[PDB]
Amino acid sequence: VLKFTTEIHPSCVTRQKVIGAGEFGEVYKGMLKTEVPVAIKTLKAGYTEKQRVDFLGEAGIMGQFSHHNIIRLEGVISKYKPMMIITEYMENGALDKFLREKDGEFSVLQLVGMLRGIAAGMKYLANMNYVHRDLAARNILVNSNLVCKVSDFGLPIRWTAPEAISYRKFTSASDVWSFGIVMWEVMTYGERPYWELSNHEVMKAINDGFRLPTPMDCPSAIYQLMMQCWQQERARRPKFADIVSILDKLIRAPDSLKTLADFDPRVSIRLP
Numbered sequence: 001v002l003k004f005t006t007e008i009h010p011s012c013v014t015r016q017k018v019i020g021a022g023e024f025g026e027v028y029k030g031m032l033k034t035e036v037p038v039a040i041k042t043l044k045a046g047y048t049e050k051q052r053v054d055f056l057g058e059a060g061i062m063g064q065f066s067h068h069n070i071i072r073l074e075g076v077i078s079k080y081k082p083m084m085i086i087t088e089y090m091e092n093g094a095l096d097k098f099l100r101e102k103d104g105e106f107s108v109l110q111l112v113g114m115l116r117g118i119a120a121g122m123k124y125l126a127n128m129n130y131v132h133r134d135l136a137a138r139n140i141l142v143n144s145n146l147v148c149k150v151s152d153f154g155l156p157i158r159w160t161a162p163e164a165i166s167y168r169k170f171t172s173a174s175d176v177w178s179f180g181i182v183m184w185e186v187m188t189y190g191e192r193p194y195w196e197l198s199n200h201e202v203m204k205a206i207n208d209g210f211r212l213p214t215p216m217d218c219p220s221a222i223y224q225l226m227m228q229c230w231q232q233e234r235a236r237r238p239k240f241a242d243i244v245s246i247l248d249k250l251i252r253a254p255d256s257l258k259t260l261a262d263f264d265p266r267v268s269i270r271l272p
């Protein structure tokens, strides 16, 4: 498992601030010498056998991935305690919070470019036979070039395909459903999917045939694509290769994004 990983000596790692929690240990922002900022997930004293298997196994799969749109593993501390998984760090942070804090600040082309990068990372994962299971804007990091990196921070009805909810069938095709939700999150600057509907109401709406409406000022082609990610029949959804191809072609012929889907207003204002 620790094959594709680099072993880092503890003297090279400085933990500075807690930024979250892991399964059995904290997550920190810190600095790595070999200086670069890093995120650090620890496995603290008392962890179980299963926790150790899952922790090192996680580092092992992360080391295997080498792609522009997948979070990069700097290395692992396994020979000393506490054990650590060390990744790159992004000052812009997670995509959901980023978009909510920068509402309306980007061009359509910038937003679609983010989605193309997410899709390319997902195509890579699916090709590598890795099913994400929790694809959502909260699990995507944004670098200072606006490049999105798929990650998994650990624990989602509103993002999950019907077959995954109903009978636990998680595949790259259920990840495609989630990707459609991510497209909607990006184009709305981080709006909550389905707004205040409860989890049960969301599932009932989906089963009844309802789907999320168009975001404001959304290219028609982008809404059509997200709608095709939400087909009930798993086999009819696009594969990630199809999604990447379409997004690449739209970006390369950017006039294609100027045609906007109609937005259904909730409020009427009568003025002269």
Ligand SMILES: Cc1ccc(C(=O)Nc2cccc(C(F)(F)F)c2)cc1Nc1nc(N2CC[C@@H](O)C2)nc(-n2ccnc2)n1
Binding pocket: 019, 020, 021, 022, 027, 039, 040, 041, 058, 062, 065, 070, 071, 085, 086, 087, 088, 089, 090, 091, 093, 094, 125, 130, 132, 141, 150, 151, 152, 153
């Ligand atoms: C340390 C760390 C460990 C693991 C992962 C991770 O992705 N494993 C993973 C597992 C399976 C599949 C995939 C994959 F690749 F398929 F998607 C990826 C990410 C981070 N790195 C990290 N964790 C956090 N966390 C976690 C707790 C949250 O509250 C904050 N925050 C930031 N961070 C913030 C600003 N710049 C960076 N980085």
